[PDB]
Design a protein around this nucleic acid. Sequence first.
DNA 1: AGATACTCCGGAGTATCT
DNA 2: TAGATACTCCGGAGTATC
Lengths: 194, 200, 199, 198
Amino acid sequence: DVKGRILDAAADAFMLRGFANTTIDDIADDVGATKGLIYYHFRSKFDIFLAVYEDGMRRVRERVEPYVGAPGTGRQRLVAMSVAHVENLMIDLGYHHVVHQGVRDALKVRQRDALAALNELRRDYERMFHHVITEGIADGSLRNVDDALATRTLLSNLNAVDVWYRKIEGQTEKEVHDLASQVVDLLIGGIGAT
Amino acid sequence: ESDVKGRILDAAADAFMLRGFANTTIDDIADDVGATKGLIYYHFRSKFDIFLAVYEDGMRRVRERVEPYVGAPGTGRQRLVAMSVAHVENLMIDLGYHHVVHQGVRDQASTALKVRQRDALAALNELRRDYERMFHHVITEGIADGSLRNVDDALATRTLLSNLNAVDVWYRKIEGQTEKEVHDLASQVVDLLIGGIGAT
Amino acid sequence: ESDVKGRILDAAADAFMLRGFANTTIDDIADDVGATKGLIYYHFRSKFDIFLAVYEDGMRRVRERVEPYVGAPGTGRQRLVAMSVAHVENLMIDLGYHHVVHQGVRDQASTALKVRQRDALAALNELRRDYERMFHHVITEGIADGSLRNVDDALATRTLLSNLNAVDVWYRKIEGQTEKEVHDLASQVVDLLIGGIGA
Amino acid sequence: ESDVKGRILDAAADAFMLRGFANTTIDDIADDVGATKGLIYYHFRSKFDIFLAVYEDGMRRVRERVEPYVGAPGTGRQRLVAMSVAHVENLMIDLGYHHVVHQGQASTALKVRQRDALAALNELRRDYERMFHHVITEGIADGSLRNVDDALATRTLLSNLNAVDVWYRKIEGQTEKEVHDLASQVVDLLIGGIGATA
DNA sequence: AGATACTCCGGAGTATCT
DNA sequence: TAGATACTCCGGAGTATC
């Protein structure tokens, strides 16, 4: 419904100053309206975070998951979906951060175990990759190294584009994709051909 | 210059890292060092001043290790790899001092701040860009005398320092890590970053 | 509509005048208009934001009352005395407001402020300086073309405005004032600032 | 010793003018003197005592240089002008002290000694504005001063003479003679007004 | 002598609530 | 939804100390 626009504003606000330095009537002003709407839809302020995680976490699936079925190597295919991952990062940025804003933060029972579910839907999103580099090393397209660290260091590095990439808000599909491609070419290819 | 100031900075750095700058109180930091709130305010006048003190120590403590390798013997990548391990070596050592120097930029325009604090905060937000610069400046000459691939400098340096610091989202603590046993792993992940993945 | 906010400003402006910014608490301002801390905080993000709201309004009124007197006829002197009476008139009727535009310059560097607050305050302070250089322009017109003695127009401006505002010291407000009584007193005050004493 | 206190009050008064009484902390004053709070409290039982100590000093400081001019020869205007300019240069060299004389009386906890001390200290200020109130009354009586309300002309005169701290900041390295030279220009406008006769 | 801390407590700011 | 209730926690004056 009309819930979509508060999250589009709450996501960036939650990314802007963090969850704490974000007050709730701060987001009441970024979508100029009643702050009762906020509670009539969301039973508490943490509901907003779970919702932005909710409509975010699965949002990433829809872009990158289709690239698992596409044929080819581990490299030929991991770069295919990791591009889509950081492609998605450059488009819905605010959501992308709220899928990791649990790092610096009592609760309710239903609200808490809500978060437990999405946390493993992130696990299984990450573990989708953890397979493909396990195959990637075995296949021979990927530099023979520890298969369980490289998963940790990919989604460490894939999500890390939020650190330096600010926004363009109008960058076409071409230029998000073509910077999504030379960012993973930097990570998958490393630097130094000899 | 830190006798008991050092152990205030040390204890608050962990707290800011495990429960955020928001949710750590001064009498939290007080308990962590065995005294009460009055001692901490005897050595710092605001709470944000504890933060800036960790921010300044955390960066003096990384340019002391890495900057020696700027003029290290060898190739641009050989210096670069030298640099980027020392960066991770102290990240893994002082993960507490690190989580505050890289996660403290939103304050810029959105928090009540005396000017002395505010312009001292952005004084380090440009101190870091010099640390970023001395990397960038060797990803350049890593290519001028051809030690690395011809990809554009800026993004390569921008992506890398982002990569170098992204080790805190998963790095555990191996209680009793020797000075080379972080080196056995720091050097592991820089070469996964410089070498990337995939043969010829 | 937004006339509850005016009550908060009216209450805050007075409470700031007497008690001062530090000793005025939100619950106090909440008491002056008979509500809780909440209603004060429903119309303002911070306490320094009600301070800027009094400043902004205060400068808005005094510029409205005084400005139509410089583009007016008469000499540079007769215009100067016309604005100067109007300025002290604003003093005598709304001095809870004038006292915050006339005090609060220290916040510049030693008080904690969001940069919207520090910048928004710096804006009004140059709204001040542009108001005050209306006076500078006219003393020069008065001095040069006949009206006023050939004195240092910079010091004359610095003095005059400081004398114009020094009325905050000895002035309090008779219960149920009348603006007819205050216009005569304001012109009495102005008579000695431009006329001085002596011969 | 006795010098050490004087630079507490010096630094205190200066801070009180720039931050105001409320916004200067005890550790603030400790810094401008380069010391610790346990010194200032060894030296002063409360922070308000700091305020009255400089109130009490800055008032005998201003009176010690202006009484010689109320008995000084000259008509009303002459000595009144001479009184005022002496009062002004006082504020131009001590305006940390000069400001503090009008920044006070039952608001916050005011241990009975110092409320009794304070509104007594206010009395010597009223008696101070009386020497003027007299000589302006003595000035309108002879003819050196024009025929105006002696009560109002007193209030508006020293109100004005104290309003110098609005624009005069400090120079800290100004000669006595360039201070006295500027103080007269100020009072030449306060007394002479602005506007000729022809 | 007077430097180090303790301790008491106001008072701004917040989430949430009927 | 407005304005309200209850509450966290920073900072400051003041005192107690080995």
